[PDB]
Symmetry: C4
Subunit: 327 residues, 4 copies
């Protein structure tokens, strides 16, 4: 009854994947995927380009486990290049790096330093400035470019037309995100993946599902509705390999975790669109990633899918509504 | 299922605005709007006509920042006139003043005092007494009259036909409102703005979205579905410029904030339709208004809208369902 | 809706809001006169519940004086119930009701002889053989208006009316102290239940009593708006001084006992009500004043000068379900 | 709005049963039911095959009250056989026993020991391994086999065609279940029973509703939408007859209750799909079961159903939205 009402948006919590006939065990499924149309991964996990999540140590950790880390850009170009070189000089290991609009010089140095992918990011990926930066990169240098963040078919189509090698989806869903309350803007993440994958898959362009992952189950849901990989922040921020500081709040140890659109991140008249928060310290990332990969394998076993491509073809979900004390 | 069921009603929390292709930056958008058909504002913010929110200092503050304040009527005619004169005597600043049903004498004195707009208020705007008062004002004096509060198409049409220069929308959504629980009456504010805007827009008559604003994001939502401006109470009640008293509750400083239909406000056999509450002290209104305006600019940027006219044209929304500890 | 046994969405009071109409009537001007049964009228549409923590003679005298009516509960010997009814009648000839259960023909007889104005035939499941038999037997042996409940369906409403019901009490599920939903898994949301039952009863001119679930004055307006002629109230009145419930100090607050008639204590088993406590509210007149005031406000918003007009003009909208009150 | 969306899933809390005309009292209803196509029970209650719920003492209690207990498999074959023999030597009492995939030797020993039903269970019942194990059992020995857990029509149909004598439904609903959050997989239990019973009732094959029972009212709901019986874990875990350990926490006594997919159960590199929890100690199981049976009787009385078969015929439900302090 609303003219401007385009429908009901679903987030991860709104749905559950329905089991299929299965002939494959969790241990047997292949988790190989495409990061961009020219770069592959062994597992579909990416660490977020945030200054409390990913520098060289996190990037090295991610790559060793078959994923990839995106070096954040909240540092001068020289330091970012050096972080990339740190990962690259640690054996033949893939690594990514973030840039912002009009940062062509930063992009050039990164590419020279041997980065495998450039992540061109903005709060609003479907914009004139972003597209102009994209076209400039593709014409000046030889590199795969992931562009984001977008949530619509139209955005996805236009970015692909201008040379996007990967599409990053997510406005609204981040754990430290306040765009939804500051600007009133967003799209629930399942719906956003569905819309963007509906265009991108037609062109063989990978969708990165960015933000809102809380449990391993969410990874399965994101991939099932069309994503090729997921980008993760808060979960990895609590690990020993994250660059964030530590603080003892009362009894337990916490790691700092802040949005790149927070007051503190922007200092490194403002209208912040992210908070500065704390997450519980969780130790080594390897144990953390193992559980995440373990959960996804279990999911794909339930859906009888031996690969992500198969999962796209076989998956379906149900909408759900939203006395034992756990030890 | 019920014949009397007119459908599902949405409030601000129920929806999220969808991003469009954008070639305008937040800093570049124009927030100019019409308060009434003959009075314009530089920003679409109005402070509520309540005795804990708007007297002359709040009204001056709002006017200086491009908005307007409505002097409340919980005082003798002479006192209300003097408050208006205080705003008027400090630069050529705009100001409004509230009156109730049959208060023709008060309105006359306010108009003579140079008030820019009269706000004819009632719990139930769509009524015989309100219409009569409106017609009497329009025939005895020359001034723009805003009439409210209403939530239906029929109400909006009738008030416009009888000469209303602006329509104030909102029954149910105010933070201190108990009409919904005392009378069981109301309409969720997004739905109410849509219904009323569907009639008023072709007439070129501005809709004021009154009540329920908690975050800057809500302002964007209100304007996007048809409103020309928003009226705000509780957010401004906490500022140093509001007339409410201060109380120290344990650790933090609070300001009094009460509905004009509360027992205490009606004392200044009763059946109250508002509560007497407290809100945290927030300091200078300038910083508060800065954030609100900033959030709206962010919104219009996401929606590629360089003006409010453009926002009405381009906006769409999605209906939504309703680990990190903030520092 | 995907399930073959799914008959649709059920709405309770909290699920909806009444939409304002054009109004030419003030809250003070509306008439609250209504029918209790097709032969008994009331000045206000409020009934106090037939529970042993809510209504004995003092509550029933309170209700009647204010324009409503009280239903004396049946958790007492027959002679005792008659004496309560006689206490109400001895003071101004005020109207009063009384509850009976299935097969309690002797009790109904004594009550009618005592001058009761209406008999309330009550069961957990009103649409049953035993209830129908008792109803038919009453109508044939004595001359009295009989309210029957509780029911939630069109077919229940129709059959009870065809067997002589003078009023229909609607409510399975909504009571504040009710656990039928949890114990039996049974019930219908109260807005939907009133709509279904009134759709049948309005054709025969038989009043609907909306029983249970009232928390705020606004709920009264909603119930009447969708077809009810009156509402029955328990927990709100249970905290008043006129209620027969005991009082207990818990912490720094005085509480009144309030228990379901299907609770262990009331029956003294598979209980379908809880034993609870409600905050003490003082005299009932002030409480009833607020309730009536809120309903007047509602009828003013909906431009309805009477309950009849409210039935004709009312519509509602479905809704989704940092100012700190002093 | 989503193509892979198969609809809204309902759990127990989402519905309420609608009363029918009744000519039967709660005390008059028959609770007799089929456990499998060749085994009948006096009441439709089964205790879960978990090591904190059912060993011989629980199984004897369930049998004497008219139901049945399923001896868990987290013990050696000889120990499980010994538990079965303990129940059989306590008079002619029904008893069941659980096996996993490929546990043909275990099944043979249990059958030779006089077990009345084999419960072939897996996290994902609709799989190649489960089907092969089923066909192997049916071909090598003579016993009724209950197979689970499944949530779909296709799964139900295939297991039945391959010789299942009972179908256990439930992926998602258990009180200690985290398959939902670890794998992102599940189906709300009312919907799951509906889908599976739509197939199984055509073949006269009983549906067991497994998991998520919290109140007696839930049993009525499960049977009403097509189940022949319900399996219960958490409710019975707190009884004196459960094998769980006891522990004082504060001033209240708790019993241990853990998923069989918990790390604690699998110890008796893990990716658990159940939690380790505690439930309040509730004394003898007899009083507990009495309330559940009484609740179901009350339900069938409301629905005018003198038997479960009649309940299937007459039942309907409504979908619902989801100041008195209890003593
Ligand atoms: C929200 C955000 N990042 O989010 C990542 C995707 N969820 C973020 C990161 C750093 C700074 C900021 C800040 C600077 C706080 N805010 C924005 O940039 N907001 C914004 C609003 C509308 C538009 Cl159209 C544009 N734009 O680039 O043209 C930007 C935000
Ligand atoms: C609720 C309210 N204001 O709300 C502002 C808009 N949300 C308010 C303010 C002062 C006094 C009151 C009081 C006096 C407490 N309440 C009403 O006036 N209620 C009301 C109900 C229905 C009608 Cl039909 C009429 N009417 O005069 O025609 C009035 C309420
Ligand atoms: C639930 C209830 N009253 O509710 C009033 C309306 N909500 C109540 C009052 C006293 C005792 C009880 C008790 C005795 C606790 N429970 C029932 O009577 N339950 C019940 C269930 C199904 C049927 Cl079919 C019948 N029946 O008489 O035919 C009765 C309940
Ligand atoms: C979840 C569960 N039981 O649930 C009972 C019914 N809800 C459970 C019990 C013991 C171990 C486990 C463990 C071992 C923790 N997890 C699984 O077995 N998970 C799983 C995932 C997908 C598949 Cl395709 C299969 N499989 O049948 O090969 C198994 C889980
Ligand atoms: O300040 C911000 N505001 C909104 N989103 C942000 C901000 N900073 C980072 N993000 C996004 O949030 C994601 C992480 O989401 P999380 O894993 O749910 O913590 C990142 O990959 C970014 O896309
Ligand atoms: O007592 C009352 N009851 C209901 N609404 C009120 C009352 N007093 C003021 N209002 C409305 O509530 C608005 C403020 O809502 P808020 O900004 O959400 O606090 C005012 O502009 C009035 O329209
Ligand atoms: O024990 C019980 N179980 C269920 N309903 C009850 C029980 N006792 C009283 N009731 C109902 O609950 C109504 C009161 O509801 P309340 O006003 O919401 O407290 C009564 O008028 C009865 O219809
Ligand atoms: O570890 C587990 N993960 C998920 N489900 C489990 C696990 N262990 C047992 N279950 C299921 O949960 C049921 C008990 O559900 P409850 O009665 O709601 O506690 C059992 O009968 C099993 O079907």
């Amino acid at each position: 009854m609303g003219t401007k009402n385009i429908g009901k948006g679903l987030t991860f919590e709104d749905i559950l994947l329905v089991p299929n006939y299965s002939e494959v065990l969790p241990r047997e499924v292949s988790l190989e995927t495409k990061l961009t149309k020219n770069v592959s991964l062994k597992i579909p996990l990416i660490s977020s380009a945030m200054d409390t999540v990913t520098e060289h140590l996190m990037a090295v950790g991610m790559a060793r486990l078959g994923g990839i880390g995106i070096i954040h850009k909240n540092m001068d170009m020289e330091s970012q290049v050096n972080e990339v070189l740190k990962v690259k000089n640690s054996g033949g290991l893939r690594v990514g790096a973030a840039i912002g609009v009009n940062e062509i010089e930063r992009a050039k140095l990164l590419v020279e330093a041997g980065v495998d992918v450039i992540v061109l990011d903005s709060a609003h990926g479907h914009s004139l400035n972003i597209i102009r930066t994209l076209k400039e990169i593709k014409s000046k240098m030889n590199i795969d470019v992931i562009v984001g963040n977008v949530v619509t078919e139209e955005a996805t189509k236009e970015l692909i037309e201008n040379g996007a090698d990967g599409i990053k989806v997510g406005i609204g869903p981040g754990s430290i995100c306040t765009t939804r309350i500051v600007a009133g803007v967003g799209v629930p993440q399942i719906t956003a993946i569905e819309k963007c994958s509906s265009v991108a898959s037609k062109f063989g362009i990978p969708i990165i599902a960015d933000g809102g992952i809380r449990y391993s189950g969410d990874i399965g849901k994101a991939l099932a509705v069309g994503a090729s990989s997921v980008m993760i922040g808060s979960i990895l921020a609590g690990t020993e390999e994250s660059p964030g500081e530590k603080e003892l709040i009362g009894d337990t140890v916490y790691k700092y975790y802040r949005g790149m659109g927070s007051v503190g991140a922007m200092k490194s008249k403002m209208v912040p669109e992210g908070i500065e928060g704390r997450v519980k310290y969780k130790g080594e990332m390897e144990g953390v990633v193992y559980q995440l990969v373990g959960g996804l394998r279990s999911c794909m076993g339930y859906l009888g899918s031996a690969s992500i491509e198969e999962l796209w073809k076989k998956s379906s979900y149900v909408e759900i509504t939203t006395d034992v004390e756990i030890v």
